């Protein structure tokens, strides 16, 4: 759907719902957290520099990401929520 | 108690309260300081109007269709008085502006019912409809309207016969 | 001080809602403009055609009182009738 | 008529007016959020670089944008209101 | 009269006097707000550069600029007011 | 698990659990401090510079790291726990 | 008299005493307001470049300059009065 521009990242986060331990403890939701993981959907042009020239992404489609709690913005299309990203708020792929 | 020693009756018909005259500005009769206004619109809402921006909206609707208007709110505070004063003494429009009856829960009680008589709508909180969405299908229509110091009364308005005996009909079973 | 302008300024009368009633009447028989803040108008905005005249004006520690203006006559007989009846 | 200088683009916003769900739930105006999209109307030169150079912009004309809820600034002109914003807030188009 | 340096730019003001609607309603001056379009008097020599090169301004003389509400500072010579600001800072042209 | 981007760093922290001075003295865990040394898991790619290059990086697996006591992001996966920094607030190996 | 480095300029302020309108209306010295435009006494050297190139300052000796009105630190030597002010916060001369 949506394309990015240069460094930005389309992430689908987890959805993962229910919580719980390995040891079979379920956390309600309330004690939960936002998800710090997400599915990679779109990938832009790529980072620009200075002397004009753009570099291609790390980040690939279908790849999932980690990312900070706080990085990211929501934006809603057709009923479905994305989250964008620049690159430099990703941290780390599988 | 009548202030002299003669013994007299005044009779009034309509909604009429205890407001108006927000500005001398406001003034059709010169010869007794009174406000009448023909074939006036009105405009129900039950919060301050300070904001230029959301004032405007309707004066252009109404500067469209020509015929005056008059403000029933908690108050016209400030810029939003200033423009509507201004715009009044240039003679493009004809306006007046008046505070709403009542107090605390009175408010919902009274507008209410000067709404359900003149044809419009109330505009309250709970139908979420902000100033600049206002047209001229929700502002009643009202045949004469007289605004002085204290008295502010309505001669008719465009409301539904069946609706006022309806409203007539639940006051009295709210009696009990 | 230095002369090229002669003027003064004294307080408005009243206190609380006098003010508007007492400015009005002070502005209805000088023949100009009370400028309130109704009006909508800056003090940078203001001209020599909204302010009113004056034949003569004392000024002393407590009392200020105009001789004349410029009023229109039958603006005062509609404010003392609109008193009158007002008396009611 | 508005002739961008450099990096700015002129956005029109969607003025979607009622807002309802898929499920066909209303929403009032008051409960509203000022919308994130937008159509694109005039886009300048380009970002200039520090060498003196002029990327072309990756936006153009007539795309739908959408952009940051806090990015832009209203301007007035002929009875109509645009919105300018730069590139670097520009999130992403479709 | 006066000389800009670099990308300092003269804009002189609109001055729109009274404010009135197409529909004819008018807006006191209470209620005005400081207009964010003007006129430019003069150009400096242009934007310098990291590595000394000067790029030739994009504003001309004689064209009509549209700029920030908070951008701009005032300055008084002759009588006249002047509004300077820098390059960056202006908005659009016409 | 984790593959770093740029000159993003995974450390595994040290968890000495029980602290105790060289004469013997023995410290409560309240009154104990988080470490401000770790083990380093996985490194990315290296420092992006503003001309393209990607200079190699200076820490390697296995190599015991010291750093700052604010750095560091958590990060959760498969019930295991992860450190991650970036080069610039990595301290000092060994 | 003294020696600037790189990009400061002196400037010597204005001491136009009495202040009065065009229409000789005089402003008492309450009411004003420090003056913005000045005098240039001695220049430096020139902008430093971030590749060591030093470009020659805009301004000449004995030109009038207006500057911001917070710009420019006091200075005492020999008894007199100067104002010391950098390239970037110089607005424009005559």
């Given at each position: 759907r949506l394309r990015p521009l240069y460094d930005k990242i389309v992430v689908k986060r987890m959805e993962e719902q229910e919580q719980k331990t390995p040891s079979g403890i379920i956390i309600p939701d309330t004690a939960k957290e936002k998800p710090q993981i997400g599915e990679v959907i779109a990938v832009g042009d790529g980072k620009l520099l200075s002397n004009g020239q753009i570099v291609s992404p790390k980040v690939k489609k279908g790849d999932k990401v980690v990312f900070n709690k706080y990085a990211g913005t929501e934006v809603e299309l057709d009923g479905e929520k994305y989250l964008i990203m620049s690159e430099d708020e990703v941290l780390a792929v599988i | 108690?009548?202030?002299?020693?003669?013994?007299?009756?005044?009779?009034?018909?309509?909604?009429?309260?205890?407001?108006?005259?927000?500005?001398?500005?406001?003034?059709?009769?010169?010869?007794?300081?009174?406000?009448?206004?023909?074939?006036?619109?009105?405009?129900?809402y039950e919060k301050k109007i300070s904001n230029v921006?959301?004032?405007?909206?309707v004066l252009e609707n109404v500067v469209r269709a020509g015929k005056p208007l008059l403000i029933i709110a908690e108050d016209v505070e400030a810029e939003a008085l200033a423009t509507l004063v201004v715009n009044h003494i240039k003679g493009v429009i004809r306006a007046c502006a008046v505070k709403a009856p009542g107090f605390g829960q009175r408010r919902k009680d009274y507008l209410q019912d000067i709404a359900i008589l003149t044809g419009g709508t109330a505009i309250t909180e709970e139908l979420g409809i902000k100033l600049e969405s206002v047209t001229l299908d929700m502002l009643g229509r009202a045949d004469k309207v007289i605004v002085d110091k204290d008295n502010t009364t309505i001669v008719g308005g465009k409301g539904s016969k069946e609706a006022i005996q309806a409203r007539i009909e639940q006051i009295k079973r709210q009696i009990l």
């Open positions: - | 108690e009548s202030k002299s020693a003669e013994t007299t009756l005044e009779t009034v018909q309509g909604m009429q309260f205890d407001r108006g005259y927000l500005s001398p500005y406001f003034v059709t009769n010169p010869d007794k300081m009174e406000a009448v206004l023909e074939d006036p619109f009105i405009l129900i921006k959301d004032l405007l909206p």
